[PDB]
From Swiss-Prot, chain A:
GO biological process, one term: carbon fixation
Coiled-coil stretches: 46-80
Main location: other
Quaternary structure annotation from Swiss-Prot or TrEMBL: Homodimerizes; may exist in higher order oligomers in solution. Forms a complex with McdA:DNA. Homohexamerizes, interacts with shell components of the carboxysome.
Protein's UniProt name: Maintenance of carboxysome distribution protein B
Function: McdA and McdB together mediate carboxysome (Cb) spacing, size, ultrastructure and probably inheritance in the cell, together they prevent Cb aggregation. McdA is an ATPase that forms dynamic gradients on the nucleoid in response to adapter protein McdB, which associates with carboxysomes. The interplay between McdA gradients on the nucleoid and McdB-bound carboxysomes result in the equal spacing of Cbs along the cell length. Stimulates the ATPase activity of McdA, causing McdA to be released from DNA. Undergoes liquid-liquid phase separation. Incorrect positioning (aggregation) of carboxysomes results in reduced CO(2) fixation by encapsulated ribulose-1,5-bisphosphate carboxylase (RuBisCO, cbbL/cbbS), which leads to slower growth.
Section of the entire sequence shown: 77 to 156 of 156
Keywords, comma-separated and alphabetical: Bacterial microcompartment, Carbon dioxide fixation, Carboxysome, Coiled coil, Plasmid
Curated annotation (Swiss-Prot), chain B:
TM region(s), chain numbering: none
Any Gene Ontology CC annotation: carboxysome
Assembly and interaction partners: Homodimerizes; may exist in higher order oligomers in solution. Forms a complex with McdA:DNA. Homohexamerizes, interacts with shell components of the carboxysome.
Coiled-coil annotated residue ranges, if any: 45-79
Domain of life of the organism encoding this protein: Bacteria
Organism: Gloeothece citriformis (strain PCC 7424) (Cyanothece sp. (strain PCC 7424))
Shown chain mapped onto the complete sequence: 78 to 156 of 156
GO biological process, one term: carbon fixation
Keyword Transmembrane helix: no
Protein name from the UniProt record: Maintenance of carboxysome distribution protein B
Cell membrane among keywords: no
Assigned keywords, A-Z: Bacterial microcompartment, Carbon dioxide fixation, Carboxysome, Coiled coil, Plasmid
Other information: A type 1 McdB protein.
Length: 80, 79
């Protein structure tokens, strides 16, 4: 049947990753599959997915900060 | 003429705890030191441009730390 698969590389915060990876192992699931289940479940619970979205971009905005921190702290030692 | 301006300062934690340790064991106050630091470095352009650059980063540093603090704290009750 028509069931292709698409490959992309994913980076997750360590504390969350080694907990999701533990849940996927705790229940005989795959990381790529738990994401699929969540996305299909939330996509049909729209008032709930809206909260996930704002949480996601607030995690990305959070991510830029942790990066921009090291962006500068590295640039500091180039002068200190 | 001689006047003084009363600016409130917010110094990074590790450095502040180190300047106060310097001035206490030197018979100095951190504000006179700041006067001395500026008066020294401004007469020496090439080194000024460096402490400018170190500052430019020292501020980008803390303003990035500010973006993080606000992002998590809004997540914290966003659940």
């Amino acid at each position: 049947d028509t069931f292709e698969t698409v490959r992309n590389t994913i980076r997750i915060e360590s504390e969350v990753d080694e907990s999701l990876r533990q849940l996927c192992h705790e229940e005989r699931i795959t990381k790529e599959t738990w994401l699929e289940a969540a996305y299909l479940y939330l996509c049909e619970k729209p008032e709930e997915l809206a909260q996930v979205i704002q949480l996601a971009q607030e995690r990305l905005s959070q991510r830029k900060a942790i990066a921009d921190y090291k962006r500068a702290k590295t640039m500091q030692e180039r002068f200190l």
